[PDB]
Amino acid sequence: LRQTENRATRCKVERLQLLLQQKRLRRKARR
Amino acid sequence: LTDDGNKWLYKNKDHGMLSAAASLGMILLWDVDGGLTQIDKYLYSSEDYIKSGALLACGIVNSGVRNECDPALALLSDYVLHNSNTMRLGSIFGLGLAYAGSNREDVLTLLLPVMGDSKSSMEVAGVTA
């Protein structure tokens, strides 16, 4: 239960990390 | 803490770990990427104290920057539910301080229900208020 909650948290952490990397690449592209 | 904060958190005891971890976000204020990178490792600990402190750290990191993306929203609405225990004060306070000026009906409607659910002790109720 707690372990699978941690797994889901890790999944969303990876998702948002990739999204943030894309966002900052796009930002630095123009700035 | 940034060098080796795990030992620092562990030598911290009782309820201290909450604030000890939130200090990580305070240090990594306004830096979403750095905060996430330095908080992910501590985000998964056997004791929920460290997890809630990490949630506070992420909320503090998000606070002050109005990024259209809402990593704080996603991560912290994942935990806004009591999860069978009252130790969600950290999540609630983090969400608040992160979205202070946002006034997003999304976060308002996420927070108001959990505020009264027959299981939100006065601590949780005050934090969410």
Swiss-Prot record, chain A:
Domain of life: Eukaryota
Protein localization: Nucleus, Nucleolus; Nucleus; Cytoplasm, Cytosol
Coiled-coil segments on the chain, per record: none
Complexes and interactors: Interacts with GCK; the interaction occurs preferentially at low glucose levels. Interacts with the proteasome.
Its job: Facilitates the ubiquitin-independent proteasomal degradation of stimulus-induced transcription factors such as FOSB, EGR1, NR4A1, and IRF4 to the proteasome for degradation. Promotes also the degradation of other substrates such as CBX4. Plays a role in inhibiting the activity of glucokinase GCK and both glucose-induced and basal insulin secretion.
Record note on domains: Contains three domains that function in concert to promote proteasomal degradation of bound substrates. Contains a ubiquitin-like domain (Ubl) toward its N-terminus that is necessary to promote substrate degradation. In the middle, two domains termed Catch1 and Catch2 are necessary and sufficient to interact with unstructured regions within substrates. The long C-terminal region associates with the proteasome.
Name of the protein described by the UniProt record: Midnolin
Covered range of the whole protein: 380 to 410 of 468
Curated annotation (Swiss-Prot), chain B:
Source organism of this protein record: Homo sapiens (Human)
Protein name: 26S proteasome non-ATPase regulatory subunit 2
Signal peptide: none
Role, per record: Component of the 26S proteasome, a multiprotein complex involved in the ATP-dependent degradation of ubiquitinated proteins. This complex plays a key role in the maintenance of protein homeostasis by removing misfolded or damaged proteins, which could impair cellular functions, and by removing proteins whose functions are no longer required. Therefore, the proteasome participates in numerous cellular processes, including cell cycle progression, apoptosis, or DNA damage repair. Binds to the intracellular domain of tumor necrosis factor type 1 receptor. The binding domain of TRAP1 and TRAP2 resides outside the death domain of TNFR1.
Top-rank lineage group of the source organism: Eukaryota
Family according to the record: Belongs to the proteasome subunit S2 family.
PC repeats, residue ranges: 19-52, 53-89, 90-124
Subunit text: Component of the 19S proteasome regulatory particle complex. The 26S proteasome consists of a 20S core particle (CP) and two 19S regulatory subunits (RP). The regulatory particle is made of a lid composed of 9 subunits, a base containing 6 ATPases and few additional components including PSMD2. Interacts with RPGRIP1L. Interacts with CRY1 in a KDM8-dependent manner.
Tissues expressing the protein: Found in skeletal muscle, liver, heart, brain, kidney, pancreas, lung and placenta.
